[model samples]
Target: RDFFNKFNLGTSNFVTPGKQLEYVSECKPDSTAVICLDQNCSVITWHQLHVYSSQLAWYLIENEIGPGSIVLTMFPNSIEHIIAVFAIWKAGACYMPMSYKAAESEIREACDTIHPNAAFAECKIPGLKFCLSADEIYEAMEGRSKEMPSDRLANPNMISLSKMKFIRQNLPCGLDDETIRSWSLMSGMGFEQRQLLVGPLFHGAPHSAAFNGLFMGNTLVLTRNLCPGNILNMIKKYKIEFIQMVPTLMNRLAKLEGVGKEDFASLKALCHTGGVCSPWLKQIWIDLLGPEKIYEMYSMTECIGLTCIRGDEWVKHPGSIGRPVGDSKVSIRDENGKEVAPFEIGEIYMTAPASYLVTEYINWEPLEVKEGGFRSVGDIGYVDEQGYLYFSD
Candidate 1:
């Protein structure tokens, strides 16, 4: 129902996703792109993301998984995971982002059918086939960062298994027509939403953030294993303009010392998602960080689309998931396809042209399709009279 020629994302599609990072290299060529702290802080430059991703892409291509092949990985959050995601996509492979929390049996179960051409792991496991570990990538990088500094990713907000469980469990469901419009807005908008990927690399949160970062020319701080000190360090070190996080991490920070100070002064905006933002937590952050700077973003792992809040809009409506991005189209409608009005919560539906893939991954069907080129992520939400989106739950 739409012209493929009409896509006009304007920029030529990079032959590989790694090539898409060229803009970032060109813009912040010399600036530090990411500071990976495992034992030591490995400062990656924008140019490095381009070069490293290209190198990784070459390695993956050489491994017999160029384009359409599924490359599964189970790293929490590491340079290896980020580089591999780009390498796989850039090499035309579909990335199979999986939770690190996955049990060995779950891995085996999925592995049987998925049969990914290759699997990636940052650490070693006893009985795994088709696995690629961080050590492998390190060796491939010509062992450049042989000695990871002691400062490596020491996160104060150490996300334990309990937190991970909360993210998977407490996150609510449902999207509708209004949500669809909100997502469409991103495609046509000239600017990509500035994003902060707090979720692990395998989780939908980080991957979606990475996707938007690549397409929109938005800079991603690339922080993994987000706890406390690590998150603060990233925000300050990079002067990260925008970010997204689960309310869990935010609340944790609030309870700790030195929050509500000017520690995060460099941050231009925030998009809190993954879970709910508490009222007291919001008030504390607004007072300390300046209410205008703290905002919220709502989406789902199935399809994280639509609904963002920022500035005084967020301050006034402390718990509301703000307005839709201008280019995005979102809907809150009943099962009968009747569109719901503002303040009426319903299943959220959304989509964008870029959401489609020419090919499908192993054993997976295309997630959704809309009559006029739209889709939804199956999340529940409502809209307000001011054209804002909200969710409780």
Candidate 2:
């Protein structure tokens, strides 16, 4: 009951990110909400974020960037980036994150496809009617009411772009208020803890992890640098409890000179996904951090399906990525679309509730769907008799 009450779970009213911040600020106003360690260290409390985001939300609303509008944001990992995201949500608009590393041509192509209403970017986007940099937003927000926007939408969505070079498809994934709430509840890390954002926010996994952490009243540490040394330093300096990274980053950290178990003593959970992790690399982390603190997930940006395995479980299953989670179901099929027996390698297909899947893609067709609504993202794998899944090279 206490946990449910803290997050207002099991309730009829949906809770948006803005609403979550409001609740946290009301209860723990002074608690650290974000610690940005980019060029300079900047900290903001839940109360400050709540008020500042609301003020910026008012500015957005006044410009007619409200519900059903898509706002493009291209900024490096920093305090202002997060503030801009929260402000977009508070203004009842969808957020479309573009990497700061994206080329101008790519940004222009994305804007052409999505027809964004506004942008909070480093420079003026060519197509958008309204564009504001972080400095501009701060300047314009002065004297704006700090109270919550009255016309805020209860649910706002997120737009994810495909990784295809020069052909960024707008994949509108369902990241509304209810979806975020359920994700936070299901994460098993629903309580407040210090979390580090290691991956770029443009990626689906890190974006969800960051927002989920904030929703749970956790302090988020953001860094523009992804160097293994800087990551290690931040972990020790901030006493970071959680982090989500890709296998490449994990391998780099594992192979970094002078890295030791003591360097990761403060880490409670380290989840790796987005790419295949070599067994040797996984073994190194398992040996250093023990099987209890490491976790691996297999999924794609499309939100089609997911599988997870903890380090302890991986010890027994070695190469397996664990079984389907929640209401998700998985099947291995041969080229003819027939289900393959256990241990026989085939294309992996997965199915989940419709709401959990990407709502639509503006420029691309849906993933190949087979019988029973199972979809494939082109991964080839096999499942053991015990139901553990393993990739097929």
Candidate 3:
């Protein structure tokens, strides 16, 4: 009964990500929603987050930013950034994350391609009619009603822009309520745990970790500084139970001095993705955190498919990236699109439910799709006889 109630799987009414926050806040109003650490630590409770985002949502709605509108956001990984994203969704507008470090020309090019309805950025974006800094948003939202906005979209999109050398691809992807629910379950981080976000929120994996952790009523700790020592101290200070990082961050963590297994005693899982991790580094983490606590995934921002492996499993199949996750499937094919036998190196293609794939791409060619609806994101890998995947250089 508890499991069914927590997930609300059988209900006909689908809860959007925005509505999920309301539900979580109602259940655990005093629980910490987010803890952002930069020069200082700032924490916001679930109820506070709900109220503040609702007020900001009202402000955006009044400015005519609502359903079908895409709002560009450029802020560091701070509590303000989180609130802005949730407020955009609550206002029935898609949230498009932009890096605060991006140059003016890059921002202009992206904005020109995306045609965002409004922006929550530090400075004015040239040619944009509506732009508000975090301070401006706070001032504008003051005295507004904290009541939840009634005009919510059933499926608010999350747009991600990918930089591929000289080409900037605008990828607008929307996850249905079911996919969102299932993916949250698939994360295996459990409920209401403390999670640390180690990567920039503009990236796909980090963005998913932030919102998905929120959806599960988890407290998210974020910091602008990726300094290994700072991260180690945060893990000990916050008792973080779950964290997601890329190989680069993991390598940094491994290289930090005076670190040991005792420091990560509070961690329940350490999920790594975004790039291939060297076996030596993987072993270091396995030795420190135990094999069961380490996890690796192979996926792309395109959301075509995913493959995950546990450290214990990886020990048996040294270089494998695990098999397809959930209803997703993977195939290796030759240049002529013929399926390759096990142990034969070829291009890796993946397929998932049509709804899980990216809805559209602007200013770039679509991903290469083979027969059977399988798509390639330019990855090359081969599966063993047992269906374990291994990537090639």
lDDT of 2 by residue, 61-95 (tens): 88888777888888888878888888888887888
Model 1, residue 195: C-alpha shift (Å): 8.4
- Look at candidate 1 and tell me the lDDT of residue 365: 58
**Per-residue accuracy of model 3 over 1-393 as CA lDDT, tens digit each:** 233227434333456666777778888889788988777888999999999999999988888888778888898899999999888878877888878988888887777777888888998876665888978878878999998898356234677767532222223232345555555544556677899898888887898888877776789998888888988888998899999989898898878888889999999988888887888999999999999888777775466777788898889899887878767778898999888999999988888654456455555566776667798877888999888888888
As a whole number from 0 to 100, the lDDT of residue 44 in candidate 2 is 94
- After superposition, which runs of candidate 1 have C-alpha atoms over 4 Å from their true positions? 1-16, 26-29, 99-101, 122-130, 138-197, 210-230, 233-240, 300-305, 316-319, 327-382, 391-393
lDDT of 1 by residue, 109-163 (tens): 6656555567777545444334777777755655343221111111111111221
- TM-score, candidate number 2: 0.89
In angstroms, how far off is 345's CA in candidate 3? 2.9
Clashes of 3: 0
Ranking, lDDT, top scorer first: 3, 2, 1
